[PDB]
Structure 1
Amino acid sequence: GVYDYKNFGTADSKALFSDAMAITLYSYHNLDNGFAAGYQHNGFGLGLPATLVTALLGGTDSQGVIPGIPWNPDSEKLALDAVKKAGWTPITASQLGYDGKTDARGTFFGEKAGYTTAQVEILGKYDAQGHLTEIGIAFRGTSGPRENLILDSIGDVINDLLAAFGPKDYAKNYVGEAFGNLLNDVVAFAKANGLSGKDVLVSGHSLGGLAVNSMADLSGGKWGGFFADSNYIAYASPTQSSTDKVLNVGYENDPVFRALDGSTFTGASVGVHDAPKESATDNIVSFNDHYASTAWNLLPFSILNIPTWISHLPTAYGDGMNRIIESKFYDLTSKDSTIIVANLSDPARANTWVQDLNRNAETHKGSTFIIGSDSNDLIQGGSGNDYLEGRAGNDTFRDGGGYNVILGGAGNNTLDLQKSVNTFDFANDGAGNLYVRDANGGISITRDIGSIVTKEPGFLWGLFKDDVTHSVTASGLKVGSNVTQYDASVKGTNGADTLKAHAGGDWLFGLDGNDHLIGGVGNDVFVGGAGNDLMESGGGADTFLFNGAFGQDRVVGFTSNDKLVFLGVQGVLPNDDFRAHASMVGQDTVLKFGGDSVTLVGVALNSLSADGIVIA
């Protein structure tokens, strides 16, 4: 997964990430609540003034940056309840025996002159006997408490500028200076409780992210090395520590994220600074109204143009990246996977295609993941290989070619093909997969899409065009009396089957179970499915399709005009070709994808060509 951390594995890293985000969100006390609500209603163009009014004053369902407005919800109570729902309770200065400054919330404040506007939350997770099992340390980003917002933010910005232009390793030392004493009290508290450093989660966003990186940097030599093995997840940090301890997560179109290299100010710092970085997720796009807008992007992308800062906002971090965590495609992703997150306002969502524009970034490589919202989305895949997820809502998908998985989610979803039905072939395994094959042999595996839209020659002999909506049914695509037939098929069962192709060619659908698929002299398309499947060509120009946890298969009779297609399979690093996955075992080429494999019986690896082995 994109958020794998150390050696915790897929599932445990996701749980750690969700805790990091929860404590980070808590540290801002819903300061951006009004902004997120105004944006969602008004967007970022014509509605920008109205969005900014809500950012300041909230409304009846949000609280902006100004406190004490009687019709706003108590957004700070809501942030406290949300952090507790995630399992966390702030730890008091009294429980720590801490002598420094806290406010009425329990937020701890920086310890030295020049750091007095630094804030950190210290939180505890407790088991059912009320024993402490985990400590959360969440540094606040730029900003402070509503009571002192402006003066506190000035002090933060002075710190931000010293990171770039002050003493060498100002950023490294930030946490030592701001919270050196507090962190000794935390070590004592942890030890008193049977905890070590491994039981400590360290997080924060922006300046809070720089703080995560500072702390990792210092954890080797300060506080007795107690935190050397702590967990460090930083959001939208301008800096990266010199250690291997930090997961630096952010949106690539967030101008603050990676602004420094890893604390050095460069030419790039004021512009696009999207060079690959080892500790960082380099290719996650926030598809918001600004990113989508032609007008807004006439302006140079820069940390110095404030409207680009919409991509920095913490709520869209929490909301977008939670959708990545929940994605049915999550375990296909890796640290530098290209992921586009649908983050449009309500008005923009209704008329803007979520797609990879590749704006203000280095060229995206490998497959592209596009993650929709729980509302009605318009999602556009490119001409390469895409993983499109609609989620809830009535979603519409388009795609420009290649090999794709398209998950409609709940709702009434539609695939608009934008061309004639006659240029496509359609197959259906009866297990909820509708396969769509374009004129170039590109295949989309689709689920939960009930309507197919095509564009057909229309009046005056094709001068005008008809949009035709087809319903996906068991017997084919139907418009009124007109049925578009599925491609000839043989369907198996979820037990062990033997299926035989007819001579004109069939799609063979083994489904679950160890299946024997016998092709003929025709062009057959082999879908072994789950289980360990034996598949024999029979001759012709065959396609073998591998998706998900496809097991250990054997392919007999594979020749030069045949094709393997790996779609939604484990372990594909961005832009892998087959050689990254291929080895000879005796007489056979073996291709491995996670714990799944395909054995090409009798085929020399040296005869194989990227033409006939599609890895998406």
Structure 2
Amino acid sequence: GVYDYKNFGTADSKALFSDAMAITLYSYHNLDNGFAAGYQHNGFGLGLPATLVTALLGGTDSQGVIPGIPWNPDSEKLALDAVKKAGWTPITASQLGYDGKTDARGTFFGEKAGYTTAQVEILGKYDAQGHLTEIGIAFRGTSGPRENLILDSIGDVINDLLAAFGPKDYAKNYVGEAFGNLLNDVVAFAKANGLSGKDVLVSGHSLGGLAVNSMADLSGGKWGGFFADSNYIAYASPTQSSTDKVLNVGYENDPVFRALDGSTFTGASVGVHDAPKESATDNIVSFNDHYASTAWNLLPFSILNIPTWISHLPTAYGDGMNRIIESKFYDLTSKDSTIIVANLSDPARANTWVQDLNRNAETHKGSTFIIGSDSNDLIQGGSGNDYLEGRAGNDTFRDGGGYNVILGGAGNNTLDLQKSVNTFDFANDGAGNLYVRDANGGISITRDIGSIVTKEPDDVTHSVTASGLKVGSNVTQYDASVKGTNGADTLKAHAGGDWLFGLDGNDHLIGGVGNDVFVGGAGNDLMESGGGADTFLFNGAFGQDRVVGFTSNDKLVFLGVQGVLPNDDFRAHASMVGQDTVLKFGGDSVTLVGVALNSLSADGIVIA
């Protein structure tokens, strides 16, 4: 998964991530709520001024920067409720025996001259019995309490500038200078409750993400080494720690994220700074109105170009990256997977195709994951390999080719092929999967898409049904198939070639002399070629399969399988066990009985 941390599992990394995000959002007290809400209603073009109005004054359903407006919701109380729902309660100055500054909200303030506009939240997670199980440390990014926002932000900006232009270790030392004493008190509080370093989660966004990385850098040597084994997840940090301790998360089109190299100002800092970084998720795109706009991007991409900071908004981090977490494709992803998160305004969503424009970024490689909104989206896959997720709402998909998984989700979803129905083959396994094979052999596996649109010289809409694609009474037939059951089946192909669908269970698929398409499905399947030019398709947790009679003109296709790193080919996954080539993908495998590994070519083995 993209947010895998240390040696924690997929699940435990996700739980850690969701908490780091919750506490990160809490630290800003919904300051960007009005901005996020303005943007969602108005967009970033024409309506940019209306968006900015709401950033300042909010409206009937959001609070901007300005406090005390009667018709605004109490966003700060919503922020507190939200962090509590996630399991977190602010630890008071008095619980910690802390003698520095807090405000009326329990926020901690930086301790030394030059650091007094620093903010941190210290939070506790408590079990059913009311015992402390976890501590959250959430450093605030640039900005402060609504009461003193301008003055506090000026202080923060000086700190921001010093990270780039000040003493060499200025970023590294920031948490040491700002909260050295506070953190000694946190160590005593943790010890007193039977906790150690491993029970502490450290997070924050932007300047707060800089602080995450500062704390990691100081953790070996300061506070008695107590925090050395803590959990550090930083959002949109300009810096990266010298250590291996920090998961540096952000959007690649956020100009704050990785602006510095790990603390160094370079020529790239004021432009595109998208070089691969070991600690960082390098390829997550916020597909927002700015990113989509041809006119916006006639201007140079730069932290100095203020409208580019739309991709920096903490609500867009929380909302879009939570949908990554929730994705049916999540466990296919790793740290540097290309993921395009649908983050369009309401007006832009109506007429803009979410797609990998690869704008202002180094060239994307490997498969692409595109994550929709819970509203009606237009999602456009590339000509390489795509995982398209609609989520809720009536979604429309296009895709330029290759090997794809298209999940409609809830709603009435539509796949627009933009070409004649005669240039495709269709197959259906009777268990919710519609297979679409294009004129070049590329296969899409689709679920929850009930309508196919084609061009017939010009748009024609086909209903996806059990007997074929239907335009009223008119049927485009599915390719010849033998459907199994979720029981163990023996299925035999006709000499003309068939699609063979195992479904669950350990199945025996017997190909014939024709061109068959084998889909063993879940369970450990035995699949025999029988001759011809055959395709074997593996998707999801496909089991341990054996393929008999695989030859030179046969194709393996791996799609939606575990452990595929961006751009992996078959050699990353192939070995010889006895006289057989084995291809392994997570816990799943294909055994090509009697096939020498040196006989295989990438044109015969599709890895997506």
Pick the TM interval, shorter chain. Answer: over 0.9
**C-alpha distance in structure 1 between counterparts of 2:128 and 2:525, whole Å:** 47
SS in 2 for 1:322: helix
The CA distance in 1 between the partners of 2:169 and 2:412, in whole Å, is: 54
**SS of equivalent to 2:21:** helix
Query: Equivalents in 1 of 2:242, 2:381: separation in Å?
Result: 37
C-alpha distance after superposition, 1:469-510 (max 9, x if no partner): 000000000001210000000011111110000000000001
Task: For residues 514-552 of structure 1, give each alpha carbon's deviation from its aligned partner in whole angstroms, at most 9, with x where no partner exists.
Answer: 100000000000000000000000100000000000000
Q: What TM-score, normalized by structure 2, do the two folds share?
A: 1.00
Secondary structure at 1:244 match in 2: coil
Q: Give SS of 2:479's match.
A: coil
Tell me by how many angstroms 1:28 deviates: 0.2
Partner of 1:97: 97
Shift of 1:227: 0.2
User: Whole-Å Cα distance in 1 between the matches of residues 415 and 274 of structure 2?
Assistant: 33
TM alignment of 1:510-589, pairs within 5 A: 510-589=502-581
- For residues 347-358 of structure 1, the aligned pairs below 5 Å read 347-358=347-358
Rounded to whole Å, the distance in 2 between the matches of 1:489 and 1:133 is 55
Q: 1:600 deviation in Å?
A: 0.4
Q: Deviations over 1:222-253 (max 9, x none)?
A: 00000000000000000000000000000000
Cα deviation, 1:359-378, whole Å, max 9, x if unaligned, reads: 00000000000000000000
Tell me the alpha carbon deviations over residues 83-131 of structure 1, each in whole angstroms, 9 at most, x when there is no partner.
Answer: 0000000000011000000000000000000000000000000011110
SS in structure 1 opposite 2:227? coil
Q: How far did 1:148 drift?
A: 0.5
Question: Structure 1 CA distance, aligned partners of 2:520 and 2:448?
Answer: 21
Q: How many Å apart are 1:63 and its aligned residue? A: 0.2
Provide the C-alpha distance between the structure 1 equivalents of 2:45 and 2:493, rounded to a whole number of angstroms.
Answer: 57
| Distance in 1 separating the partners of 2:92 and 2:142 | 23
Supply the RMSD in Å over aligned alpha carbons: 0.3
The superposition leaves residues 129-163 of structure 1 with CA deviations (integer Å, 9 ceiling, x where unpaired) of: 11000000000000001000001001101000000
SS of 1:234's equivalent in the other structure is: strand
3-state SS of 1:62 partner: coil
SS of 2:491's partner is strand
Structure-2 separation of matches of 1:272 and 1:229: 33
2:374 matches 1:374: yes
Aligned-pair CA distance for 1:442: 0.3
Q: Could you tell me how far apart the structure 2 residues matched to 1:480 and 1:499 are?
A: 32
Per-residue CA deviations over 1:199-227 (Å, capped at 9, x if unaligned) read 00000000000000000000000000000
> How far apart, in 1, do the equivalents of 2:488 and 2:34 lie?
57
Distance 1:59 1:196 in 2: 44
- Displacement of 1:258 in angstroms is 0.2
Q: Secondary structure at the match of 2:78?
A: helix
CA displacement 1:139-198 (0-9 Å, x = unmatched): 000000100000100110100000000001100000000000000000000000000000
TM-score, normalization by structure 1: 0.99
Matches of 1:244 and 1:403, distance apart in 2: 35
1:425 is aligned to 425
SS class of match (2:229): coil
Matches of 1:363 and 1:103 in 2, distance apart? Answer: 46
Q: Name the SS of the counterpart of 1:216 in structure 2.
A: helix
- How far apart, in 1, do the equivalents of 2:192 and 2:463 lie? 65
User: How much has 1:275 moved relative to structure 2?
Assistant: 0.2
CA distance in 1, matches of 2:598, 2:7: 35
Structure 1 CA distance for aligned equivalents of residues 485 and 72 of structure 2: 58
Aligned to 1:365: 365
Distance 2:142 2:313 in 1: 11
CA distance in 1, matches of 2:570, 2:418: 32
Which whole-Å deviations, capped at 9, do the CAs of 1:299-321 have from their partners, x for residues lacking one? Answer: 00000000000000000000000
Provide the secondary structure at the position in 2 that maps to 1:27. Answer: helix
* Equivalent residues, number: 608
Counterpart secondary structure, 1:388: strand
1:424 to partner: Cα distance: 0.3
For the residues of structure 2 that align with 1:237 and 1:305, how far apart are their CA atoms? 18
Q: Distance in 2 between matches of 1:568 and 1:157?
A: 44
Q: Residues of 1 paired with 2:148 and 2:136: CA distance?
A: 25
Distance 1:455 1:104 in 2: 63
Aligned to 1:460: none
Find the aligned partners of 1:63 and 1:517 in 2 and give their Cα distance: 61
Once the two structures are superposed, what CA deviation does each residue of 1:41-61 show, in whole Å capped at 9, x if it has no partner? 000000000000000000010
**Counterparts of residues 3-18 of structure 1 (less than 5 Å):** 3-18=3-18
Q: Distance in 1 between matches of 2:374 and 2:87?
A: 25
Deviations 1:565-593 (A, max 9, x none): 00000000000000000001111100000
**Counterparts of 1:203 and 1:45, CA distance in 2:** 33
Residues 54-92 of structure 1: CA deviation (Å, up to 9, x unaligned): 000000100000001111000000000000000000000
Q: Secondary structure at the match of 2:180?
A: helix
Q: Which runs of 5+ in 2 are unaligned?
A: none
Q: In structure 2, how many angstroms separate the alpha carbons of the residues matched to 1:496 and 1:471?
A: 31
Q: Equivalents in 2 of 1:129, 1:528: separation in Å?
A: 49
SS at match of 1:555: strand
Which whole-Å CA distance do the structure 1 matches of 2:156 and 2:594 have between them? 65
1:449 CA displacement? 0.1
| Percentage of pairs with the same residue | 100
Partner of 1:228: 228
Tell me whether 1:604 sits opposite 2:604 in the alignment. no
1: distance between equivalents of 2:527 and 2:338?
33
Distance in 2 between the 1:424 and 1:435 partners? 10
Q: Secondary structure at the match of 2:228?
A: coil
CA distance in 1, matches of 2:421, 2:434: 14
What is the DSSP-based 3-state SS (H/G/I as helix, E as strand, rest coil) of the residue aligned with 2:240?
Answer: coil
